[PDB]
């Protein structure tokens, strides 16, 4: 796995990824 991901796992910090982006109602502008 990625080094940064492993370091975050060792730090106990969880990473959240979008699953249903259509739920959000607004100009998120995630893409660029």
């Amino acid at each position: 796995t990625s080094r940064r991901d492993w370091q975050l796992q060792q730090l106990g910090i969880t990473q959240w990824s979008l699953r249903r982006p259509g739920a959000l109602q607004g100009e998120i502008a995630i893409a660029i």
Binding site: T1, Q9, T14, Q15, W16, S17, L18, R19, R20, P21, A23, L24, Q25
Partner: protein, 364 residues
């Protein structure tokens, strides 16, 4: 005025008593056969008729006609006992009188023979509140009781009493009143009271009673007061809704269907009234756990959640288990992270948003 239904409808006869057949039949058989014991104890939940049955037994014991299970209700003794002015019947509130000195004076009256009754009946209520010295005095009295006295005890915490006291008395445990019996009793009471009612209102009141007749009568009185002297389905439904406040279940349902606007509206509604956000999260976690248990086995859901049985069953049948597990894990993480959030409301909103639209990335 119109009096209170509970006060005006104290069971004055064994037939009027609702349920509790295993106790009434045994008492009637004992009275008919003459097998009467010195000490009787009654145990059960609130509003199950322990005091009423004790009073009925006391009335039957000292009736002019004789020791019968069906008091006449017309002789002077019956009238005095009903009015509570009977000389030979001594009613004691142990909660109010707990010190040994107060109980000793009452217990010393056993020396005098009955004045106008066959037996000198003592009815002690809330006996579990007596002190250690009071219990010792009662045990001393009960060790060698006079043949012409009887003791009746009623309490909701029999375990508090000493084992010695329990061992020297016959104990009867009272059950709940089910639902149909409560509905029939309420229907009869309202018919006698000349108060308009509807079957649906009676069914809802019986369901909300939860096995307690006193609670059912209190709810009926509340409906009458709010209904302006009339019992109606709309009045009872509004009364129950005022005591429901089902924002948590609505939030869970909105989240499961991914409806952010409903979630925000419910959050605002909950914030309108004073509520604990951590308590709300705990309730949501419990609801999700119950849904998962029901999915594993239909028998998980019991009669305690009969009010929201249909909604829970629908959620269990519809939602796949994986979504329930994901939401439960997300709510656990949210509860863990809540203390250090900028605000409880902000933490709850963030966690609900994460459950709605975000998926965590597990290691490996």
């Amino acid at each position: 005025s119109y009096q209170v239904l509970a006060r005006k409808w104290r069971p004055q006869t064994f037939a009027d008593v609702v349920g509790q057949e295993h106790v009434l039949t045994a008492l009637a058989n004992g009275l008919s056969l003459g097998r009467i014991h010195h000490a009787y104890l009654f145990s059960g939940t609130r509003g199950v008729g322990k005091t009423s049955i004790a009073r009925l037994l006391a009335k039957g014991l000292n009736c002019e006609t004789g020791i019968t299970a069906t008091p006449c209700g017309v002789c002077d003794n019956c009238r005095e006992i009903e009015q509570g002015r009977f000389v030979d019947l001594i009613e004691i509130d142990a909660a109010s009188r707990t010190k040994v000195e107060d109980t000793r004076d009452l217990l010393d009256n056993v020396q005098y023979a009955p004045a106008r009754g066959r037996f000198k009946v003592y009815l002690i209520d809330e006996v579990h509140m007596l002190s250690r010295h009071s219990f010792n005095a009662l045990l001393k009295t009960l060790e060698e009781p006079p043949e012409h006295v009887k003791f009746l005890l009623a309490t909701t915490d029999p375990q508090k009493l000493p084992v010695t006291i329990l061992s020297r008395c016959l104990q009867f445990h009272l059950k709940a009143l089910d639902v149909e019996q409560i509905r029939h009793q309420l229907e009869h009471i309202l018919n006698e009271e000349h108060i308009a009612h509807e079957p649906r209102a009676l069914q809802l009141l019986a369901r909300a009673a939860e096995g307690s007749l006193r609670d059912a009568l209190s709810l009926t009185d509340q409906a009458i007061a709010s209904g302006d002297g009339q019992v109606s389905t709309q009045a009872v439904s509004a009364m129950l809704g005022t005591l429901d406040d089902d924002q948590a279940l609505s939030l869970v349902e909105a989240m499961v269907e991914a409806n952010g606007e409903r979630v925000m509206a419910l959050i605002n509604e909950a914030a309108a009234r004073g509520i604990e956000w951590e308590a709300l999260l705990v309730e949501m976690l419990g609801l999700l756990h119950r849904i998962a248990m029901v999915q594993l086995s239909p028998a998980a859901l019991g009669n305690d959640m009969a009010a929201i049985e249909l909604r829970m069953r629908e959620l269990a049948r519809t939602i796949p288990p994986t979504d329930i597990q994901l939401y439960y894990q997300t709510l656990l993480i949210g509860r863990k992270e809540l203390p250090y959030a900028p605000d409880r409301r902000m933490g709850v909103e963030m966690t609900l948003l994460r459950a709605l639209a975000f998926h965590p990335r597990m290691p490996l």
